Design an enzyme around this catalytic site. Sequence first.
Site, PDB file in Angstrom:
ATOM      1  N   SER A 180     -10.260  -4.111   6.573  1.00 12.75           N
ATOM      2  CA  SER A 180     -10.461  -5.105   5.516  1.00 12.75           C
ATOM      3  C   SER A 180     -11.483  -6.205   5.758  1.00 12.75           C
ATOM      4  CB  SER A 180      -9.135  -5.758   5.109  1.00 12.75           C
ATOM      5  OG  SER A 180      -8.309  -4.849   4.398  1.00 12.75           O
ATOM      6  N   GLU A 187      -8.874   4.358   1.581  1.00 16.19           N
ATOM      7  CA  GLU A 187      -9.434   5.421   2.423  1.00 16.19           C
ATOM      8  C   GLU A 187     -10.261   4.923   3.601  1.00 16.19           C
ATOM      9  OE1 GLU A 187      -7.969   6.919  -1.144  1.00 16.19           O
ATOM     10  OE2 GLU A 187      -9.549   5.415  -0.837  1.00 16.19           O
TER      11      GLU A 187
HETATM   12  C1  LIG Z   1      -7.400  -4.067   5.040  1.00 18.86           C
HETATM   13  O1  LIG Z   1      -7.583  -4.039   6.256  1.00 18.86           O
HETATM   14  C2  LIG Z   1      -6.303  -3.411   4.492  1.00 18.86           C
HETATM   15  C3  LIG Z   1      -5.400  -2.767   5.331  1.00 18.86           C
HETATM   16  N1  LIG Z   1      -4.414  -1.957   4.952  1.00 18.86           N
HETATM   17  C4  LIG Z   1      -4.321  -1.518   3.551  1.00 18.86           C
HETATM   18  C5  LIG Z   1      -5.407  -0.476   3.266  1.00 18.86           C
HETATM   19  O2  LIG Z   1      -6.112  -0.575   2.262  1.00 18.86           O
HETATM   20  O3  LIG Z   1      -5.589   0.468   4.036  1.00 18.86           O
HETATM   21  C6  LIG Z   1      -2.915  -0.971   3.280  1.00 18.86           C
HETATM   22  C7  LIG Z   1      -2.767  -0.575   1.809  1.00 18.86           C
HETATM   23  C8  LIG Z   1      -2.611   0.234   4.174  1.00 18.86           C
HETATM   24  S1  LIG Z   1      -1.709  -2.297   3.654  1.00 18.86           S
HETATM   25  O4  LIG Z   1      -2.345  -3.459   2.948  1.00 18.86           O
HETATM   26  O5  LIG Z   1      -1.909  -2.480   5.129  1.00 18.86           O
END
Ligand SMILES: *C(=O)/C=C/N[C@@H](C(=O)O)C(C)(C)S(=O)O
Length: 265
Positions: A45, A143
């Site tokens: 993220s 993804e």
């Molecule tokens: C940003 O790093 C988001 C992390 N995890 C999310 C993703 O989009 O992969 C999820 C949905 C798995 S959750 O918010 O961790």
Amino acid sequence: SPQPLEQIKLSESQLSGRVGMIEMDLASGRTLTAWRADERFPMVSTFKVVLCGAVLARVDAGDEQLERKIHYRQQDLVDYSPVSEKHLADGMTVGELCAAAITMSDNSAANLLLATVGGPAGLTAFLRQIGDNVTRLDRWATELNEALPGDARDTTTPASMAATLRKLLTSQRLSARSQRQLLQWMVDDRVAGPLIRSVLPAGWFIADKTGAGERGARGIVALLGPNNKAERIVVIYLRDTPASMAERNQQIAGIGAALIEHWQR
Ligand SMILES: *C(=O)/C=C/N[C@@H](C(=O)O)C(C)(C)S(=O)O
Ligand SMILES: OC[C@H]1O[C@H](O[C@H]2[C@H](O)[C@@H](O)[C@H](OCCCCCCC3CCCCC3)O[C@@H]2CO)[C@H](O)[C@@H](O)[C@@H]1O
């Protein structure tokens, strides 16, 4: 806590994974600490900050407005959309989308913004335009967190991410107002910001964007400094460790503690 470099090594030993880290003076770009700084790590993220830098560039050029309201459908929503799932009826402004993407890590908000800059390819093109020849986004939110070993998709290097953040925040590539906006969004992070402040000694400034993915992927891009000043950019990524989220957070905090205890270098 031990010296920064030694704590970083201890963290890899304890996590059984790779750690990538850069500590850089925000004002000048002086690199203070570098460990696996040219190695690839999943951005997870943290890409959302660069995404909004591209958005702000479009605003500066007059091809976008932070006020512009974007209306979307439930079908457009992806996993983890705390803010965007609340506005199917009224929509969200581009600026609101960036606030949600950066301060709440809202994934659908990120995808909506990604579409406006030409998708992963478009964001990568923007990166190439500001001199980052390494960082690459290839997939859409969700993804891009797969973090497959040896997969170059959706990665950056600590050195590249640090330099790119510095360019967006201070090189005047973005207008003064846009630089200020990007900074404020990071200062406003609701995911990790408050928690980090609760454990920081009085006087330490924090602005940040965090991320997490599969195979232990974890990341943070931040501005940190004593005297309530954003003195340095600190980028830390972790990959390929089977450790619990709690321990990965603890290790990252430990590297932070080492920086704090030995700041004058
Ligand atoms: C940003 O790093 C988001 C992390 N995890 C999310 C993703 O989009 O992969 C999820 C949905 C798995 S959750 O918010 O961790
Ligand atoms: O001597 C310096 C300081 O040493 C301790 O502070 C501790 C603090 O009590 C602890 O909570 C923190 O943990 C580290 C918390 C870091 C959180 C994340 C930081 C981010 C920022 C940038 C990107 C990666 C990490 O370490 C410091 C330094 O030892 C004392 O408690 C404090 O009174 C004193 O001023």
